[PDB]
Symmetry: C3
Subunit: 119 residues, 3 copies
């Protein structure tokens, strides 16, 4: 075809989709961040059969837990789809900490990843 | 690099993703419309730290409120992910009126935008 | 413009987004599958004004019902956004049976489609 999508083309696409200025991801989730007022919001997707736990305290941005979480929901589980911080900015290099879970089993694994400037 | 994704490549991708024939957006939301039978459905995403309020009485497509809204939900908030009309069609140039909200500061702001033909 | 996205570029992008190795779709839904441990997870999107029913018994992968379904919700209605199998793998050619619905007129129709390797 003489031209190809890069393997991470989804980052470019979803940063545009959400008008995001930062993003963060691992093999198991991704989140696209927008700054506004004194804080920030992330639109969140699961990856690799995993998702982010909605349990309060399981997520930290620069050591601060989100003030609100919206989720997709089920009889036994729920997965983060949006999370917000009232007073913490998204910025390059700050750490998002999380528990990742999978609907396949009852596992829960600690993870962390650093925010990157949107392409 | 010789070739580049347009800044609005997400429009192309997400219209294809939902097989949408019309879409609408601002800096703060986007919605991808499919016509079917006598009405239409939009698949909805937030942008720029905002999202669409799930108050159907506050959304109007060609002056008519959707009768169904499916949402991502949380303790005190919820965001539109799909909304439908029984008897109103999506077409280019017709107006979507809506209320946009942000989890960061609990802002609620009226907006309006015109539907455009999918690329 | 010399270069163009294929009409099915959303397949490449969404498989990348969720780090999926298989996918499946019709005019009315798509689903992106990841394998992990002994089972698999699909991240699900509606198409063409339809969505996948969350009703128990309505979904089979290789003749097995999912152990969990997460949903976008509203009133008593809900649409699959993520679904999993404890013990069933995604693999090329295996059959997903489902019930597709639309909010516009409450249609509910059975269908099936075969998994395809991610590009």
């Amino acid at each position: 075809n003489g031209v190809g999508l890069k393997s991470t083309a989804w980052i470019n696409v979803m940063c545009g989709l959400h008008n995001a200025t930062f993003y963060v991801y691992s093999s198991y989730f991704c989140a696209f961040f927008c700054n506004y007022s004194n804080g920030c919001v992330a639109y969140v997707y699961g990856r690799g059969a995993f998702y982010l736990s909605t349990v309060s305290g399981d997520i930290k941005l620069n050591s601060v837990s989100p003030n609100q979480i919206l989720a997709m929901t089920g009889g036994s589980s729920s997965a983060v789809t949006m999370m917000s911080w009232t007073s913490t900015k998204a910025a390059e290099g700050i750490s998002l900490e999380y528990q990742r879970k999978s609907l396949i089993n009852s596992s829960s694994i600690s993870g962390s990843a650093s925010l990157v400037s949107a392409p």
